[PDB]
Write an enzyme that holds these catalytic residues in place. Structure first.
Site: not given
Lengths: 262, 6, 262, 262, 6, 6
Positions: C125-126, C143
Site C-alpha cells: 500500500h501507498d 508500505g
C-alpha cells in the site's frame, strides 16, 4: 494427442497439439500449451500452467500455481522457440516457476529426475538441475545456473547467474551463492563461503570411509594447503587415480567459470 | 532472471 | 465497457462496470472487478485477479497468479475505496502482488511505465514505483516505499516502510534496506550500506563522463568528506549549478524522512 | 453438507462430503476437498485450494492462490490421513501455504485465531501457531515449529525445524532462527541472536510497568548474569511468585528442545 | 519442510 | 505491509 487412459478435467484447457501420456492426470483449471508433452502417470494437481516447447517425463507430481515452460525474465529474450525438459518422478511444489531457455544461453532449461522443488523455488532460463536435488522454499536460481546431482539449496537461498553448485553440495538456508561451489562442499552465508565436506550427506549416500577421507584431503588441497588452484589441480588428479570419487573435482574444475567460493 | 548479486 | 476488439476468455469473469480497452486480452480464469480499467493492448495471461479502484495502462503483460489492486496488509485499513494506478508496457510476472493504498497513506499505490516486476515481487500500500525499474524475484517493498526511475532492487531484498530508493540506485540481492538510498548509489547488505556510485548503470544510460565524475564528487561530499548532511547540502547544490544531474541529490534530500544509509 | 445460506460460486468445486457453514463464501475456481470443514462466515476469495482432513473456523478471510491442508514437504510423509486445524478470524493472504501434519510429528498442523499470515507465508507440517500472531511476507516456518501467542515473524525470515518462538517475541525481517526464542524477546540476524525485551509490544498489549521490569530482570538473568540456564531457572521461578507474567519463561523452558538463541 | 539451516 | 525491520 491425449492418451485414452489420461484424465483431463472438464475445466482444464489442453490446446490441440499437446501430447498427454497414459494414466496422466490434468487437474481442474490447468492450461497445457500446444507444444507441451506430459509423460505417463504425471499429475498436474490443479491451477497449473504448462506452456512453451516443454517435455515433462513420467510420474511427476506438479502442484497448484506452478508455472512450467513460461517465458523467462531475461531482458534479451524476444519470443524465440526455446525449451524446457523435465525428467521423471519430480515433486514440483506450489508456485514453483521453471522458465524456458534463451537462444544466447543454449536454448534449454533442463531438470533431471527424482528432484524435490519446494514452494516458490525458481529455475531461471538455461539452468541445468541434475537428479535427486532439493531446492528448499524460495530457493532461487538465476540464469545459466547448474545444480549437480544430490545438491541441496537451502530455504531463501539465491544462486548468482552462471554459478555451478557441485554434486552432493549442501548450501545453507538464507544464503547468497556468488561463485562456483566444488562438489561435496557445505556452503553458507552471503556471500556463501565453504564450511567443510558434506560428510553426513556422503555417509547417507553410501560413500566409503576411504572415499570420504580422500574427498576431505582434496578439500584441504583446495582450501587449506595455501596453494593456488593451478598448483593443486594435478595433486587432485593424482589422488583421483586411487579414489575415483575425487574425479568429480577435476570434472567440476573444467566446467567452472566464476572462480571458487572461498 | 538476474538477481543482481554483487 | 468492453471494447469490441478486446478478447475476454469465456472462463474469465469481468464484472459489469469494468473497462477493457481495444485489443486487450483477458485470459482464462482471470477475475476483473467492476472498478478496474484495463488499457489498450494489455494482456492478463491467465489466473490473474485484478480488483479495487484500479487503472492499468497500455501494452502491459500480467502473468498468472498475480494479484493487482487487492486489499493491502495494513492492519489499519478498513475497506475504504483506495486506489492503484499502473502505467504502460510493464512486465508483471507470476505471483506479483500490488496492493491498494490506505486513506492515512494518501490513498494511492502507483507504478509507472516500462518496469519489470519479477516473480513474487511485492508492492505494498501507498508505494510509488517510477519508470524503467526492476524488482527482482521476491523483492519486497513495505508500505509507503518510493522506488525512483531506473532503480533496481535485487532478489530477496526487502525495503522498510517509508524508505526512498533514489533514481538509478542498485540494491544488491539478499539485502535489507532500512533507510533512504540517495540517487545513483550501490547499496548492499542487511542493513544495507552504500558501496559507491552505480557507474556501469550510468554509463549504459547515457550519462556523460563529466556527469558521472560530478555524481561521484557529490557521493564523496555525503559519505567521505566527514561533514554532516546539513553542511554538505549547499555544497551539492553549488555543484549542481554546473552539472544538472547532481540536482537529483537536492530533490531527494527534500523528500527523505528516514535518514541516509551509511 | 453445504449450509443453505452459504454461497458456492458455480465455477468452484466442492467435493461431496465437505462441510460449509452458514454465510460462508466459496469464490470462483476454488477447490474444496471431501474431508474439509469451513466454518460460518469464512470467505475463500477465489483460486483457493483447501484439501486433506482440514477444519477451518469462523470469519476467516482466505485470499487467492493460497493452499491449505496440502500434502507436506516431508520426505518421510507417505499419504497418511494427517490433519490441519485453523481457528477463527484469521487473514490468510495470497499464496500462503499451510501443510498437513506427519504421523511421526503428531499428525496435526494447528493455527489459532486472529492471526495475519502475509503473502507467501509458509506453515509446514506439525507446526503450531497460536493466537494474534503475524507472519510477514515470505516468513517460513520449517517442520514442527511453534509460534506462540502475539509473536511476530518478520519479512523473509526462516525458522529452523522444531524451534519455538515464545509469546510476544518479535523476530526481525531477513533473519534465520536456529534455536528457541524465549517469550518477550526481540531476535534478529542470521543466525538470530537476542536484542532485549519487546518493550513496545508489551506496552501496547497492556502489560504493567512492574510486569515489564520483571520480564527485563528475567531476561538479564538468562543473558547478562553470566550464569548457566540451570542455575537461573529457580531464580526465574522465584521471580514469577510475585510477577505471574514471568511464569511464561518457566513454561517455555519445559517445552524448549533446541537450546536458546544467544 | 526442511530449510537446511546449519 | 509491515516487514518488521529493526
Amino acid at each position: 494427442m491425449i492418451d485414452k487412459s489420461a484424465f483431463v478435467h472438464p475445466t482444464a484447457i489442453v490446446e490441440e497439439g499437446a501430447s498427454i501420456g497414459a494414466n496422466a492426470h490434468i487437474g481442474p483449471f490447468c492450461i497445457v500449451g500446444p507444444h507441451v508433452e506430459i509423460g505417463e502417470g504425471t499429475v498436474l494437481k490443479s491451477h497449473v500452467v504448462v506452456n512453451g516447447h516443454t517435455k515433462i517425463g513420467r510420474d511427476n507430481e506438479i502442484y497448484q500455481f506452478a508455472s512450467i515452460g513460461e517465458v523467462n525474465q531475461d531482458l534479451k529474450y524476444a519470443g524465440e522457440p526455446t525449451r524446457v525438459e523435465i525428467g521423471d518422478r519430480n515433486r514440483i511444489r506450489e508456485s514453483v516457476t521453471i522458465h524456458r531457455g534463451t537462444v544466447q544461453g543454449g536454448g534449454l532449461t533442463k531438470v533431471g529426475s527424482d528432484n524435490l522443488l519446494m514452494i516458490n523455488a525458481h529455475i531461471a532460463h538455461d539452468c541445468t538441475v541434475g537428479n535427486r536435488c532439493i531446492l528448499a522454499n524460495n530457493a532461487t536460481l538465476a540464469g545459466h545456473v547448474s545444480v549437480d546431482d544430490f545438491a541441496i539449496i537451502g530455504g531463501m537461498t539465491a544462486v548468482h547467474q552462471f554459478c555451478i553448485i557441485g554434486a552432493h553440495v549442501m548450501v545453507g538456508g538464507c544464503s547468497g551463492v556468488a561463485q562456483d561451489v566444488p562438489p561435496y562442499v557445505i556452503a553458507q552465508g552471503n556471500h556463501a563461503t565453504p564450511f567443510g565436506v558434506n560428510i553426513e550427506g556422503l555417509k547417507r549416500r553410501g560413500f566409503s570411509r576411504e572415499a570420504i577421507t580422500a574427498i576431505r584431503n582434496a578439500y584441504k588441497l583446495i582450501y587449506r594447503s595455501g596453494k593456488t588452484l593451478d598448483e593443486v589441480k594435478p595433486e587432485i588428479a593424482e589422488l583421483a587415480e586411487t579414489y575415483p570419487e575425487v574425479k568429480a573435482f577435476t570434472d567440476f574444475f573444467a566446467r567452472s567459470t566464476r572462480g571458487l567460493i572461498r | 532472471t538476474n538477481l543482481y548479486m554483487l
